[PDB]
Design an enzyme around this catalytic site. Sequence first.
Site, PDB file in Angstrom:
ATOM      1  N   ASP A  35      70.133  66.382   4.688  1.00 58.80           N
ATOM      2  CA  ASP A  35      70.973  67.545   5.038  1.00 58.80           C
ATOM      3  C   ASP A  35      70.437  68.741   4.023  1.00 58.80           C
ATOM      4  O   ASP A  35      71.507  68.673   2.768  1.00 58.80           O
ATOM      5  CB  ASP A  35      72.288  67.246   5.138  1.00 58.80           C
ATOM      6  CG  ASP A  35      73.319  68.587   5.956  1.00 58.80           C
ATOM      7  OD1 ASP A  35      72.454  69.274   6.202  1.00 58.80           O
ATOM      8  OD2 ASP A  35      74.226  68.545   5.581  1.00 58.80           O
ATOM      9  N   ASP A 220      68.068  74.740   7.239  1.00 61.52           N
ATOM     10  CA  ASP A 220      68.918  73.366   7.393  1.00 61.52           C
ATOM     11  C   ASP A 220      68.610  72.383   8.004  1.00 61.52           C
ATOM     12  O   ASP A 220      68.567  72.368   9.284  1.00 61.52           O
ATOM     13  CB  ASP A 220      70.578  74.171   7.968  1.00 61.52           C
ATOM     14  CG  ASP A 220      71.512  73.147   8.101  1.00 61.52           C
ATOM     15  OD1 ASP A 220      71.402  71.925   7.895  1.00 61.52           O
ATOM     16  OD2 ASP A 220      72.612  73.744   8.571  1.00 61.52           O
TER      17      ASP A 220
END
Length: 377
Positions: A35, A220
Amino acid sequence: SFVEMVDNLRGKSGQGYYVEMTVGSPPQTLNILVDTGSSNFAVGAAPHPFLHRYYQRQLSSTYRDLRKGVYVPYTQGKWEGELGTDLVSIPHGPNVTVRANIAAITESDKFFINGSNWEGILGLAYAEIARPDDSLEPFFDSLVKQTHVPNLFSLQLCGASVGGSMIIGGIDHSLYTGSLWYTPIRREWYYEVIIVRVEINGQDLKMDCKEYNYDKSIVDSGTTNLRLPKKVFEAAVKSIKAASSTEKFPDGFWLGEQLVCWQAGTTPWNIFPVISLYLMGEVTNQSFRITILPQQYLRPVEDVATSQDDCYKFAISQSSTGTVMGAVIMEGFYVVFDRARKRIGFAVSACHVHDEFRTAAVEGPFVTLDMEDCGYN
Ligand SMILES: CC(C)c1cccc(CNC[C@@H](O)[C@@H]2C[C@H](C)CCOCCCCNc3cc(cc(Cl)n3)C(=O)N2)c1
């Protein structure tokens, strides 16, 4: 030694990409979602109906309790738990072991996904957005501090279940073609970048470029969709609707809820436009663009009927917290998070999406005046 990390990522569509890690002594094996949109390393540490396994601190002789709680609220999902440190390794990564901060997840809400096959999360962004505060050193900072691993990593996320590569410590030139194009990391918290122009099928959206970055633009890997500020989302949907008005779709499809299907092999890719995002370059008044195919922002999903149709969800959605260049944008590109040089690189991936007459591309140089005006304050 990078070949050892090629293909070290797996995933399910819309559920994140994960890498295998071990924590504790003796090593406990867990799948950890990668992430770049957060900065906490956290793992399931208590039973949960969607966890196949979890971290057992009791069984690790190297576990240390930090006597501090922690909670992280994401856009979607949240968890809380207990802070500690332990030894961590990445089997298909560099050959090192680091003592890392670990949040042991004891409760969560809409965070773990039924049958996702991952049990934790590796937040790869900077300490400034770490919880409880920026004094909790993120995993990658600990890795760089404790080993000789260079301060950069690269992500090759491959499309439709899914796979990819996280090259820790460098760039593997067999994973991309053409040139790498770099955009500055504007500020070290999220991986924040500046979008300076947006075109759809070659037509400029002609908005104030500040709108593209209101109130930030981030890269992201932990968010599926391309997410756009309200004003930009509306301009883009209007343009994509018009380009595809040959057919008609439920407006719940355009909200990302309803899926649309076509007879297997007959998806009309040609009626969906390409999206070009121009990013601030490395030299004065210079930008570059990445071009996104409809095969990226129409994410394929399982057929809701008893047919063998091709079904898709619209993978662009509205944001109130800035632009999010999510996994669907990253797929088909090789993305270099060059932390040492405060820049992010883009190149066409070896696993690029394939249109019949069109191609995802990274192209430059372009001239763009007043790029600094595009950053929101
Ligand atoms: C923690 C702080 C720094 C913070 C707060 C708000 C936003 C951010 C920006 N990054 C968000 C990212 O970390 C966060 C990580 C997930 C929880 C990881 C597990 O899920 C993977 C499958 C669903 C993918 N799809 C998705 C994810 C997410 C939002 C939306 Cl709309 N779709 C989202 O929330 N993903 C960061």
